Design a protein around this motif. Structure first.
Motif, mmCIF file in Angstrom:
data_model
loop_
_atom_site.group_PDB
_atom_site.id
_atom_site.type_symbol
_atom_site.label_atom_id
_atom_site.label_comp_id
_atom_site.label_asym_id
_atom_site.label_seq_id
_atom_site.Cartn_x
_atom_site.Cartn_y
_atom_site.Cartn_z
ATOM 1 N N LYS A 40 7.448 5.000 2.879
ATOM 2 C CA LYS A 40 8.115 3.669 2.724
ATOM 3 C C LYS A 40 6.442 3.037 2.957
ATOM 4 C CE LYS A 40 12.019 4.874 1.570
ATOM 5 N NZ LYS A 40 12.600 6.414 1.914
ATOM 6 N N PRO A 41 6.180 1.763 2.390
ATOM 7 C CA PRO A 41 4.485 1.075 2.461
ATOM 8 C C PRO A 41 5.085 0.380 3.877
ATOM 9 C CG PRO A 41 6.024 0.471 0.824
ATOM 10 C CD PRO A 41 6.872 1.317 0.871
ATOM 11 N N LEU A 42 5.908 0.363 3.718
ATOM 12 C CA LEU A 42 6.099 -0.326 6.004
ATOM 13 C C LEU A 42 6.813 0.837 6.232
ATOM 14 C CD1 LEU A 42 7.257 -3.862 4.782
ATOM 15 C CD2 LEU A 42 5.436 -2.823 5.400
ATOM 16 N N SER A 43 6.710 2.023 6.041
ATOM 17 C CA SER A 43 6.711 2.656 7.708
ATOM 18 C C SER A 43 6.252 2.793 8.877
ATOM 19 C CB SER A 43 6.605 4.123 7.111
ATOM 20 O OG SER A 43 6.858 4.725 5.120
ATOM 21 N N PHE A 44 5.427 2.232 8.772
ATOM 22 C CA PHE A 44 5.207 2.107 10.264
ATOM 23 C C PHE A 44 5.974 0.289 10.931
ATOM 24 C CE2 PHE A 44 1.640 0.786 13.764
ATOM 25 C CZ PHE A 44 1.945 2.292 14.351
ATOM 26 N N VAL A 45 5.937 0.146 9.875
ATOM 27 C CA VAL A 45 6.790 -0.877 10.535
ATOM 28 C C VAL A 45 8.289 -0.956 11.076
ATOM 29 C CG1 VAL A 45 7.744 -3.524 10.097
ATOM 30 C CG2 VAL A 45 5.886 -3.232 9.310
ATOM 31 N N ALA A 90 0.756 -1.235 -0.172
ATOM 32 C CA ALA A 90 -0.151 0.026 0.145
ATOM 33 C C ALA A 90 0.869 1.135 -0.319
ATOM 34 C CB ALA A 90 -0.973 -0.456 1.670
ATOM 35 N N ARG A 91 0.099 2.183 -0.829
ATOM 36 C CA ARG A 91 1.183 3.382 -1.001
ATOM 37 C C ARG A 91 0.204 4.707 0.303
ATOM 38 N NH1 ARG A 91 0.188 1.475 -5.761
ATOM 39 N NH2 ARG A 91 2.098 1.094 -7.576
ATOM 40 N N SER A 92 1.908 4.811 0.850
ATOM 41 C CA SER A 92 1.808 5.849 2.248
ATOM 42 C C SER A 92 0.810 7.027 1.693
ATOM 43 C CB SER A 92 2.533 6.040 2.748
ATOM 44 O OG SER A 92 2.361 7.100 4.045
ATOM 45 N N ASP A 93 1.150 7.514 0.488
ATOM 46 C CA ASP A 93 0.794 8.750 0.163
ATOM 47 C C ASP A 93 -0.767 8.679 -0.063
ATOM 48 O OD1 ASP A 93 1.173 7.077 -1.940
ATOM 49 O OD2 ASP A 93 2.692 8.725 -2.688
ATOM 50 N N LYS A 94 -0.781 7.829 -1.003
ATOM 51 C CA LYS A 94 -2.313 6.879 -1.100
ATOM 52 C C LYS A 94 -3.231 7.049 -0.299
ATOM 53 C CE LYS A 94 -1.553 6.267 -6.444
ATOM 54 N NZ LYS A 94 -2.021 7.622 -6.627
ATOM 55 N N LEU A 95 -3.078 6.010 0.719
ATOM 56 C CA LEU A 95 -3.691 5.697 1.657
ATOM 57 C C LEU A 95 -4.148 7.501 2.433
ATOM 58 C CD1 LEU A 95 -2.489 3.257 3.432
ATOM 59 C CD2 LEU A 95 -4.320 3.413 2.601
ATOM 60 N N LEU A 96 -3.295 8.149 2.719
ATOM 61 C CA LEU A 96 -3.400 9.670 3.807
ATOM 62 C C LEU A 96 -3.707 10.371 3.316
ATOM 63 C CD1 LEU A 96 -0.135 9.719 5.540
ATOM 64 C CD2 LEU A 96 -1.807 9.096 6.262
ATOM 65 N N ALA A 102 -2.208 0.023 10.031
ATOM 66 C CA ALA A 102 -1.717 -0.145 8.410
ATOM 67 C C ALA A 102 -0.239 -0.170 8.633
ATOM 68 C CB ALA A 102 -2.356 1.052 7.521
ATOM 69 N N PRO A 103 0.310 -0.036 7.893
ATOM 70 C CA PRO A 103 1.625 -0.708 7.672
ATOM 71 C C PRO A 103 2.749 0.430 7.287
ATOM 72 C CG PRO A 103 1.408 -2.745 7.663
ATOM 73 C CD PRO A 103 0.224 -1.951 7.161
ATOM 74 N N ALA A 104 1.663 0.967 6.413
ATOM 75 C CA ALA A 104 2.242 2.323 5.438
ATOM 76 C C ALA A 104 1.767 3.553 6.248
ATOM 77 C CB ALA A 104 1.193 2.080 3.993
ATOM 78 N N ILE A 105 0.983 3.680 7.110
ATOM 79 C CA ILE A 105 1.473 4.561 8.255
ATOM 80 C C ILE A 105 2.292 4.553 8.547
ATOM 81 C CG2 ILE A 105 -0.520 6.557 9.002
ATOM 82 C CD1 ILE A 105 -2.581 5.077 7.297
ATOM 83 N N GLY A 106 2.684 5.834 8.586
ATOM 84 C CA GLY A 106 4.256 5.480 9.935
ATOM 85 C C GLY A 106 4.801 7.212 10.215
ATOM 86 N N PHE A 107 5.688 7.632 11.038
ATOM 87 C CA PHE A 107 5.627 8.640 11.917
ATOM 88 C C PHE A 107 7.026 9.156 12.414
ATOM 89 C CE2 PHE A 107 1.429 9.437 14.443
ATOM 90 C CZ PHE A 107 0.689 7.234 13.894
ATOM 91 N N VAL A 108 7.979 8.440 12.743
ATOM 92 C CA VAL A 108 9.609 8.144 11.532
ATOM 93 C C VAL A 108 9.420 8.468 10.287
ATOM 94 C CG1 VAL A 108 11.071 7.914 12.695
ATOM 95 C CG2 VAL A 108 10.094 8.178 14.879
ATOM 96 N N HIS A 109 9.298 7.136 10.136
ATOM 97 C CA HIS A 109 9.614 6.544 8.505
ATOM 98 C C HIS A 109 8.260 7.007 8.002
ATOM 99 C CE1 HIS A 109 12.472 4.000 11.503
ATOM 100 N NE2 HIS A 109 12.700 3.898 9.941
#
Ligand SMILES: [Mg+2]
Ligand SMILES: [Mg+2]
Ligand SMILES: [Mg+2]
Ligand SMILES: [Mg+2]
Ligand SMILES: [Mg+2]
Lengths: 277, 94, 94, 275, 252, 250
Positions: free
Chosen positions: E186-191, D92-98, E176-183
Motif C-alpha cells: 500500500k502507498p501508505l503502508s508505513f502510516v 508513491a508505489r511501494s513495489d516501485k520505490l523498493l 516514505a509513507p509507502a515503505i512499510g514493515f507490517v503493512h
DNA sequence: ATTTACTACTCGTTCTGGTGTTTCTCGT
DNA sequence: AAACACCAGAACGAGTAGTAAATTGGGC
C-alpha cells in the motif's frame, strides 16, 4: 458573400423529409411540422434530399437547394423516385458533348458498355457480343446473385416483383430491394449532375430520362446496396423503409460511395479512348 | 483522442467548475477540449451526476460521415431528432 | 476534415441562418459540424462578413498541442490570453 | 458522489506558466485573478505541470485541488529555474520505490544502471571497467564537443556554459538553462506520477532531484538543448517565452510524456532484477 | 521544531516569515524554530514565502486542522536521499525488518513480543488482540459490538484523522509513507504501521464515546474531537521521535 | 401550351390541380394542356401536386418574376434523350454547326448571311453589327455612348433576357450548355438565342430607362422587362423560334 | 403568397450579492 | 482567511409580432 456548393464527397449521404412545410427562415432550410416544431436542415452538407408525401416546399426553398447544389427528390412508396429539381444551368459543356459523342457512335458505345460489364462482374465480357446480348448475360448473372444472397441470409425468395401489388404483404423482401436501389439511384443522380454529365444519355439503358443513372448504379448495386437490403428483410422489421435507409447510408459511409462515384463515371467513359476533358 | 464540446444550461456551479478542471470555457456554458474515449465517458459521468434540473449536450468527433456524435442530458427547448439514423435538432413551440 | 464549432452572440439573423446551411445548431447560437480546412475558412469568411457588432468564437480540431485551435471575431466578455504559446480565455470584470 | 481522479499524463498539456495574481478555487476549479480583477480559469487537468512565477499567491484549497488531479506545482525562479515543488505526499508505489531502492543500495547493481544510462544517451555502450566518477568524466568531454558542434551548426557565438545569471546581452546560456528547466519540470512530474523517487539517483547523487537529472540528461541533447540554440540564434525579445513555446512543440512532436515512463523502467531493467 | 498556521496569508515582509491576519495584524516568524510548517485550511502562501522556505530548507505541508488530513507537501517523492534508503534497507532485509516490527509491537502493547515469532506470525497475534480490544472497549461503553452501523462509522472516521497526523509525522521526519514493515504494498503502508501503535491509546476510545451519545452527523463530531486531541496532547510532536526510535531497533 | 403561377400554394385538394390565393379562392388548373409550369416567387408546391405533374409529364420550372430569373427546373440535366442527342449531333459536326449559325444570323438581322463564310468569320460580322447598333440606338435616345448608367442598364436588361431564354430552352427540351456561336460556357445556347431577339425589344428599353437616369436603374429595368415579357408573351414566342433554328440543321 | 429589415417587449439565463454554513465526502 | 449553498433581482441576449419594403447581388 455568394453562396457556393461544397464538394459532394464532403457531404452527408441523404435525408428523408415528411409531413411539413419547407421555408427559408433567415437564409436556411427549415421544416415546420403540423404541431409547429421547427427543424433546421443543413442543405449544404447534404448530397441529396428526399421529399416524402405530405411536404409543401416554398419557391425560395427550391432556390436555396440549387445554390448549395443539393438535389431534391420527391419520392413515392418504397422510396420510388417521382420528380426531381435542380440547377438546370449546372452542367459542363465540354463534358456534355463528350458523353454524347461516346453514345452516338455504335462502336464507341459498345466499348463503354464492355467497361461497365468488366467493372461490374470483375471479368471481361465475351468477344463480339452486342448490347442486347450483354443484357442477356446480365440477367442470368443477376438471377444467380439473388439466389446466392437468399441462401446466405436465409430469405424466402420467389422472384423479383417490381410492382407493389405483387408483394405478399408479409413478403418484405422485394420492398427492401426496391427501397435500397432507390437510395442508390438518388445519390447517383446527384453525383452525375454534380459531375457535369447528363443523366438522360445512357449506354446500356436508353430512352429513359435517367438511363445513365441506371447504367452507373447497376455496376455497384449488388456489390454493396442490395446485399444490405437482404440483411434487413431477414429480421423482418415493422418499418422496413427506415432500416433500409439507415442500412444503405452506413454502407455508403464504410465503402465511401460518394467519393468513388465521380471517378467511376470518368473511368467508364475513358474506355471510348476519346480524349477526356 | 478526439475533440470534445460540452454545452450547459441551468446547471449548479459545481458542474460548471468541474468541467473547468479539464476543459476550456470559451463562452458561458460552452466547454471545449480534446480527450480520450475513457476520459470523455468520465466527463459524462460527472455531468449526469452533478447536473440537476439542468440540460447538457455533449458532442465529440467520431468516424461517422457527419464526423461527430452528440448525446443530451435533461430537457431543453431544442430536442434532438432521429431522421433514419441521422440526428438533427428540432425547436419546440409554446 | 476536422470537427468544427461556432459560438455566436449578438449577430444579425443573416449569419445565424447561413451557419445553419452547413452546421447543426444544437443550442441557441452554438453550431457543430465536421468540415474540411478549405470549407472552414469559407465559413469564417461568412462570419467576418455578416457579423459586425456581434462576437463569434470558432474552435476546430487540429494537430496542435491542445488538439484544437480557436479564433475570435469582435469583442466579448471573455477574452483569450496567450500564456507562452498556450492560449486560454480570461473573464473581464465590467 | 464527487470522485476526482487524475488523467493519464501522456494525455495532458506539458506545462503552463502563471505570474502576478492570486490563485483561488472559485467553484471547484483553478482560477488566476490578476491585480485588475480579471478571472482566468486554468484546467489543472490536461496539464502535467504548473509553473508558479513570482507574484503569485496560492490558497490552501488550490494546492489541494492540484494534488487530487495529480498536477505538479512548481515555484520557479529566474530563467525558469526550480525553487520549490508540491504534490501528493504519498502517491508513491511501494513495489516501485523498493525496486529503485534495491538498485541503488547494491553497489554492483547501481553500476549496471549507470552504464545503461550512458548507452541510451550516446547511442553506444560505455567503456568497460569504468567507475561512476570515470564515466561521469567521459560524459563531460563529449558534452563539451556537443556544445561546440551545436553552436557551429546553428551559427551561435559560443564562449562556454555559464550557469550563474551573474556571468552572462548574450542570450544563449539563458536559453539553455531555461530549456533544461522545462525538461526537469515534466520529468519530475512524470517520475512522481510513475511512483518513483526523484531523490534517489545513480549518476547524480546528493541532490533532492538526483533521479530527475539522471533521466532528463539522457534525452536532453536529443531534442531540448538544440532547440535552445535555435531561439538564441535569432536573439529575440523575451527569450523565456520563446523557449517555452519551442519546448511545447518538442514534447508534442517527440511524444516526450508518453516515452518518459517506459524510459525509467527500461533503465532500471539493466539491474537484471524482476520489476 | 514545527509550527501550525491558520487563517492568514504567508509573506516575507522585511526579510522574515510573516502571517497577515484578517484583522491585518502581523505575526512575525523566525527562520530557525521552523524546520517544518503545517498549513491548515484557509491559508494563502506567497511566492516569496516559498522562496525563503527553500533557502533555509523548510518543509511546507498542506494539512487540514491539526494535521487531521494531509493534502500536499513540499518536497514530494522524497527530500532527504539518505533517509529514504535507510528505511528501505530496513524493510528489504528480512532480519532487519523483523527487528523493526518487534519494536513496533513492544511500543504498542507495552510488553515484549513473543520469542521465535516471524513478521507473519506477529501479525496473527496482533489481529487477535485488536479484535479483543474492540470488544472490551465496547462493554466499557454502552455500544453494541458485532465486528469491524453507527459504531463503525465513528471508528473509521477516527482512524482517518489518525492517519493524517501520522503521515505528517513521517513526512516531517523525512521518511516514505509507502515503505512499510507490517503493512506492505500500500502507498501508505508505513502510516498504518505507526498509527496502530498509538491508535488505542486515545483515538479509538474517543470514537466509542461519540458513538455512545449517538449524535447528529457522527463523522463530523469525531473529526473535531480528534483535532482537539492532536493539539492538546501534541500527538504530531511526540510521533516523530517515536518513529526514528522504531527504525533504530532495526540497526542495533 | 404554358402557364404562369404566382403568389399562392399549389395543392391537390380533391382530385384536381389548384392554386390557393391569399383570399383563399380556389383556381382549377388543368394538368392537361400544360407542357410546362413556371413557378414565380411566392409559390408553395405540395408533394401531391408534384406527383400529379409527373404523371402527366409536365415540366416544373422555378423562375423569377415573369420568368426573368431561372433558379431551378424539374428533371435537371434534361429529360428528353432524343432532343439532347439531336442538339449534340448538330454541334459536334462542323457542317451542321455552320448551318445552324446561318439561321441564327438570318433570324437576327432579317437577311441571309453572306455565302462561304465560316463560323469564326460570321462571329466577326456580328460584333461589327452589334457595336454599330448600339451607336444608332445611342443617337435615337440621346445617350452618350462609349461602349456609367447606360451599361449598368444594358447588363441588367440582358440578364432578364437570359432568364426567359433559358426557360424557353428548358421548356423546349434542349440543353443550355450546348452552343453553336458561343461555346464552352454552361449557358452558351442561352446566349445564342437571346442575341437574336435582344435588340428587337429589350435593349432599346434599357436605353429608355438610362435616359431618364433613375435612382434604382436595376429594379426599373427588371420590372420593365417583366412587363415586356408578360404583355408580349416573349417566352411563348421563343419556343417555336428555337425549334426553327435546330430544324435548319437538317 | 413568401421573405427580410427593424424595433422594443416578453421571456429566460447568467451573474451577483445578500443570508448563513463549513474547514468536511471517511474504512487497511 | 478561504470557499460553498441557497435565492430572486439586475443585466443581457434570444425569441417574437408588429411595422415596412421587396419578389432582387449583372454583363458573353
Ligand atoms: Mg440493369
Ligand atoms: Mg435548431
Ligand atoms: Mg467566471
Ligand atoms: Mg459571497
Ligand atoms: Mg412578420
Amino acid at each position: 458573400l455568394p453562396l457556393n456548393p461544397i464538394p459532394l464527397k464532403d457531404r452527408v449521404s441523404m435525408i428523408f423529409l415528411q409531413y411539413g412545410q419547407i421555408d427559408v427562415i433567415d437564409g436556411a432550410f427549415v421544416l415546420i411540422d403540423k404541431t409547429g416544431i421547427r427543424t433546421h436542415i443543413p442543405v449544404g452538407s447534404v448530397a441529396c434530399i428526399m421529399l416524402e408525401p405530405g411536404t409543401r416546399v416554398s419557391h425560395a426553398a427550391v432556390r436555396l437547394a440549387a445554390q448549395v447544389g443539393t438535389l431534391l427528390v420527391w419520392v413515392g412508396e418504397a422510396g420510388v423516385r417521382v420528380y426531381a429539381s435542380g440547377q438546370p444551368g449546372g452542367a459542363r459543356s465540354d463534358k456534355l458533348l463528350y458523353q454524347a459523342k461516346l453514345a452516338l457512335d455504335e462502336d464507341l458505345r459498345l466499348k463503354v458498355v464492355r467497361k461497365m460489364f468488366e467493372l461490374r462482374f470483375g471479368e471481361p465480357a465475351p468477344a463480339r457480343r452486342s448490347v442486347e446480348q450483354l443484357r442477356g448475360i446480365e440477367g442470368s448473372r443477376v438471377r444467380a446473385t439473388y439466389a446466392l444472397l437468399a441462401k446466405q441470409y436465409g430469405v424466402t425468395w420467389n422472384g423479383r416483383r417490381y410492382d407493389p401489388k405483387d408483394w405478399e404483404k408479409g413478403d418484405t423482401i422485394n420492398q427492401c430491394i426496391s427501397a435500397a436501389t432507390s437510395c442508390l439511384y438518388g445519390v447517383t443522380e446527384a453525383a452525375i449532375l454534380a459531375a457535369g454529365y447528363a443523366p438522360a444519355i445512357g449506354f446500356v439503358h436508353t430512352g429513359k430520362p435517367l438511363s445513365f443513372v441506371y447504367d452507373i448504379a447497376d455496376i455497384i448495386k449488388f456489390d454493396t446496396v442490395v446485399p444490405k437490403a437482404f440483411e434487413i428483410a431477414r429480421r423482418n422489421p415493422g418499418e422496413p423503409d427506415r432500416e433500409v435507409r439507415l442500412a444503405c447510408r452506413d454502407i455508403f459511409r464504410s465503402s465511401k460511395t460518394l467519393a468513388k462515384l465521380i471517378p467511376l463515371i470518368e473511368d467508364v467513359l475513358a474506355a471510348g479512348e476519346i480524349q477526356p476533358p | 483522442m478526439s475533440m470534445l464540446v460540452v454545452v450547459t444550461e441551468n446547471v449548479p456551479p459545481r458542474l460548471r467548475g468541474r468541467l473547468a478542471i479539464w476543459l476550456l470555457e470559451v463562452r458561458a456554458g460552452v466547454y471545449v477540449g480534446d480527450v480520450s474515449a475513457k476520459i470523455r465517458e468520465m466527463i459524462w459521468e460527472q455531468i449526469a451526476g452533478l447536473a440537476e434540473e439542468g440540460n447538457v449536450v455533449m458532442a465529440w468527433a467520431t468516424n461517422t460521415e457527419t464526423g461527430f456524435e452528440f448525446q443530451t442530458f435533461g430537457l431543453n427547448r431544442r430536442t434532438p431528432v432521429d431522421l433514419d439514423g441521422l440526428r438533427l435538432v428540432s425547436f419546440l413551440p409554446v
